[PDB]
Write a protein that binds this DNA or RNA. Structure first.
Lengths: 122, 197, 106, 127, 167
RNA sequence: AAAUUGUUGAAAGGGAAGGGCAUUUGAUCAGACAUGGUGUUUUGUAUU
RNA sequence: AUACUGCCAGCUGGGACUGAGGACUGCGACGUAAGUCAAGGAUGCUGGCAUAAUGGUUAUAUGCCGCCCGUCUUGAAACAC
RNA sequence: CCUGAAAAUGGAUGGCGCUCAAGCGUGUUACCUAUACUCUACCGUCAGGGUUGAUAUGAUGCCCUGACGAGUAGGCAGGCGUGGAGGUCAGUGACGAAGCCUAGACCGUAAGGUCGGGUCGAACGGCCUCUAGUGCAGAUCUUGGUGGUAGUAGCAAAUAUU
RNA sequence: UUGGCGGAAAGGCCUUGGGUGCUUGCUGGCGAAUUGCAAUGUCAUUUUGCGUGGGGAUAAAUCAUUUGUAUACGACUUAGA
């Protein structure tokens, strides 16, 4: 959501040209971050390896108002509230490795060839 | 046949050579073309200059920077012909044009190697004697190619190097032949000859 | 010694086609060294393999193969018409194919 | 098993999707013949979708047959199994979706008893 | 139930096929391979390798051998459509060839339950191979360069056109 | 439920996208070798 | 004798696609008779895996093709609605 | 062949390009391929027929043969689907009905049907018939909901705030 | 390594030297099989690893501040341990 917004140097850190400073959104998000940190502390988590593993903002029901236009017309003046959710998880290393054995099916010719190669090898 | 085929452009008609090379590239043969400045076009130099002037006249009215791009180099003229004969807007055409390479003169990796000829496109074999033709280098210099003299000097240097190499090779080959004659008339040579080698 | 080729190099060129419609069920093959239908006749009725490499091992190998055969000639310049078990992927136009000497008659 | 009956690989396996069902969400993929005057699909222009027609009809001696070679009969109970008893090699039972678990295992047990094939003898159970 | 008995009765008995008129006649081999001719195996374990043809087996196959001492090809059977007949010929006189047959080349097919998840020759077979190849070498000796010709394996080189190439 | 959205994730991307014929590659899946066969060296031979 | 033309119920060879179909049958061919056949539609032998291997679905990629549907209209992709 | 022979965006033997042609006139002859022709399989339609031997096939059953297959407006036929009703399945179901989701499967040329997996909690279906307020992509269709535009136009008259 | 040549895209071409292999120039000895009648029957690129270790000299840019030779915002031109 960046159409026709201005440009700044403070976006070069992210490789973009369009960046802003949404103070209200930042305050709401940091309040929820403090709430999640409190929840993790109550759950007994590290609070120093915590990283935002999930975060999602989706639309909420609009709050309806009215705006007045030329020639006695009425247009909508609606707010777009947010449903914010986030899950902070204790950071960990690689989850797993050592993938499936992947059983191999060889025909008679393939088995003969591998046996011959094994015999030739010394 | 070969992994890469190197054709020199000297004495070749641009259209016939471009058609042959385009068909080979589509069939899957890598090709490099050298001596594109010595490539030939059938017809008067004035006729070909007028044709290129019409080509130059063709350009987009509202933005010449997006209009047709009239490359002045002889190698790029040959490339334009080949790209006209290859369906260049599909992935197969892009693959063929990637397989193709064109140069003015012969850079080191190709002047140290073999150059072949295309009899179907050769000016001597194709054009009726007495019919006028045009040199791609002269036409390119007329239409604004800025490196005819540099290419001429570099080609002269390469030609002297190749002449010295040929003298050395000819001396070595003639010594080999003399020694073969001395060690010849043996049972093995007679047997091979009588067999048919 | 250094040479072990028991096949003949060829190029899968294109499908059987009109100007603006192609038929993937039949492919055109250019045999190397064959320039006439007369040699195409000798090459008639002969097995062909398109051999390619895949990054995934399927049945103990990373090489897969499509089988077909030269069936009849095509044109006056030694191009032949081949029918494969599965039609060639059409990305293999101008691609290396192997024509084997079997089923042999000489 | 049996002889190589016809309809081997290809007559028409692709679904006959309605025109512009991919273009619009309001247009379902259920087939509808284009009735338009200028419709390229109705006019059968080259490069357009194929229309259902009688030529695609499958062989009469293999129509309604499954890959296993059996015609599928919807079964709700051991009574339907009993009526399917004597034609095991040409028919295969298929338990109705609204059958409870205990009744479903009853039908499976009876079908195993008389050798009747079931096309879904794996639902509502663990492995 | 939905029906007490089907009014139409499907056929249960499988229809036995009627008497096909496809008799089997002996294979007619091509005239370019006579016993004793040097063939070129083009496929298999010994692909592109020169052997000598001994006998036309009853199961439409060719009984060939290397000989084993020459190129390591044992007394085997191959396919006529997969061999290439050459003009070179050795006389098969003095050899016994009527002993070998399909009964000789019985397989003893391996069972399905035994699968190689981790990873021999009959003395009668090896002795028969030794006798046959001894006789064949006693023949082959007289022709010069033939032992080395059979030892060397065949291959196609750059410029070799089999249609223009005479074997 | 859909339109329309945010996020497990997968693939595509040189001035559209979508589609038909045909293969290839990746992902995924049904069908099929306890089927009504050897009368006794393996057995869990009234169960075969 | 031989450019040629015509005929052969003349003789050989190399390829390709197809294999539809049944409880007695028909029309025929083959040594002085047993019966066999290429005669009213494919059989014989031998291999590889007892599986995503063949395939179905699906997403890309590639070759060729493919204008946005409904309507009025002689004519619509339409710079017609 | 040339002169006659001049129009406006840059430009079209389709393009590249072609000069004893890849041009023009005329002749051999090979070769390419249409949903056309020939043959084969399959689907449907039509037509002509066979069939009363068992105490097995509503003879609307089974079988044989041949020809045919474009389609707007339109006609007819055979079928799919929906809401209700009379019978029957002594049909399915709280051990889970209806409904909804599902680049999972099977069947039918198709309308669609059946099933696998999730959610769900109270009714519902097949067959023979009866019945209609029975099938949507459009009507600047009705009602409701939701987008791109778009965090965009803009929130600048009335002197002015610290 | 000694001696060179090659800047067109040189990235390759030569050369006196020492150690080893192989040699089918000629003659030998032993082995091959059963991949079962064919299955491509698998052989020579760009990178990554809590790697296998031998050499290795241990930096910039951006934001923030500032400048005005610049400037709608970006950007540009400077300064700043």
């Amino acid at each position: 959501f960046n159409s026709s917004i201005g440009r700044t140097a403070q976006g070069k850190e992210f490789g973009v040209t369009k960046a802003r400073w949404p103070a209200k959104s930042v305050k709401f998000v940091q309040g929820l971050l403090q709430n999640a940190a409190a929840n993790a502390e109550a759950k007994g988590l590290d609070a120093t390896k915590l990283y935002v593993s999930h975060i999602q903002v989706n639309q909420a029901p609009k709050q309806r108002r009215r705006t007045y236009r030329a020639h006695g017309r009425i247009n909508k003046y609606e707010s777009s509230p947010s449903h914010i959710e986030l899950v902070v998880t204790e950071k960990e290393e690689a989850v797993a490795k050592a993938a499936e054995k992947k059983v191999v099916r060889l025909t008679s010719r393939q088995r003969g060839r591998i046996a011959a190669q094994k015999r030739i090898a010394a | 046949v070969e992994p890469v085929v190197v054709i020199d452009g000297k004495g070749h008609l641009v259209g016939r050579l471009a058609s042959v090379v385009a068909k080979q590239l589509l069939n899957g043969q890598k090709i490099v073309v050298v001596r594109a400045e010595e490539l030939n076009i059938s017809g008067e130099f004035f006729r070909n200059k007028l044709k290129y002037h019409d080509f130059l006249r063709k350009a987009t009215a509202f933005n010449k920077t997006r209009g047709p791009f009239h490359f002045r180099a002889p190698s790029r003229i040959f490339y334009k012909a080949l790209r006209g004969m290859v369906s260049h807007k599909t992935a197969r055409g892009k693959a063929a044009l990637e397989r193709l390479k064109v140069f003015e003169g012969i850079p080191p990796p190709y002047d140290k190697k073999k150059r072949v000829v295309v009899p179907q496109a050769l000016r001597v074999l194709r054009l009726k004697p007495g019919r006028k033709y045009t040199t791609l280098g002269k036409l390119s210099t007329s239409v604004g190619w800025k490196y005819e003299d540099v290419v001429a000097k570099l080609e002269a240097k390469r030609k002297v190097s190749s002449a010295e190499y040929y003298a050395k090779k000819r001396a070595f080959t003639k010594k080999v032949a003399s020694a073969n004659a001395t060690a010849a008339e043996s049972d093995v040579a007679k047997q091979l000859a009588a067999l048919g080698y | 010694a250094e040479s072990h080729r028991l096949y003949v190099k060829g190029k899968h060129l294109s499908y059987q086609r009109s100007k603006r419609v192609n038929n993937p069920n039949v492919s055109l093959i250019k045999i190397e060294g064959v320039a006439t239908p007369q040699d195409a006749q000798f090459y008639l009725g002969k097995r062909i393999a398109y051999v390619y490499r895949a990054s995934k091992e399927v049945r103990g190998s990373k090489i897969r193969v499509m089988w077909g055969k030269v069936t009849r000639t095509h044109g006056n310049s030694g191009v032949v018409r081949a029918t494969f078990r599965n039609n060639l992927p059409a990305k293999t136009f101008g691609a290396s194919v192997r024509i084997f000497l079997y089923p042999s008659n000489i | 098993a049996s002889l190589p009956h016809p309809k081997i690989v290809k007559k028409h396996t692709k679904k006959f999707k309605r025109h512009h069902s991919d273009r619009y969400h309001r247009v379902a993929e259920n087939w509808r013949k284009q009735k338009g005057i200028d419709s390229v699909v109705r006019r059968r222009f080259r490069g357009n979708i194929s229309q259902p027609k009688i030529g695609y009809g499958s062989n009469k001696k293999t129509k309604f047959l499954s890959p296993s070679g059996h015609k599928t009969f919807l079964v709700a109970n051991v009574k339907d199994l009993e009526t399917l008893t004597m034609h095991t090699k040409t028919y295969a039972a298929e338990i109705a979706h609204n059958i409870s678990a205990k009744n479903r295992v009853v039908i499976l047990a009876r079908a195993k008893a008389l050798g009747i094939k079931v096309t879904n003898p794996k639902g509502r159970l663990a492995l | 139930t939905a029906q007490q008995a089907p009014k139409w009765y499907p056929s249960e008995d499988v229809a036995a096929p009627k008497k096909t008129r496809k008799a089997v006649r002996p294979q007619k081999l091509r005239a370019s391979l006579v016993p004793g001719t040097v063939l070129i195996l083009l496929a298999g374990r010994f692909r592109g390798k020169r052997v000598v043809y001994l006998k036309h087996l009853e199961d439409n196959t060719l009984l060939v051998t290397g000989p084993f001492k020459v190129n390591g090809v044992p007394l085997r059977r191959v396919n006529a459509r997969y061999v290439i007949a050459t003009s070179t010929k050795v006389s098969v006189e003095g050899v016994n060839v009527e002993k070998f047959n399909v009964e000789y080349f019985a397989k003893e097919k391996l069972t399905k339950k035994e699968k190689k998840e981790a990873n021999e020759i009959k003395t009668e077979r090896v002795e028969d191979q030794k006798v046959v190849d001894k006789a064949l070498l006693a023949e082959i000796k007289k022709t010069p360069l033939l032992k080395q010709y059979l030892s060397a394996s065949f291959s196609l080189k750059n410029g070799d056109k089999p249609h223009l190439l005479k074997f």
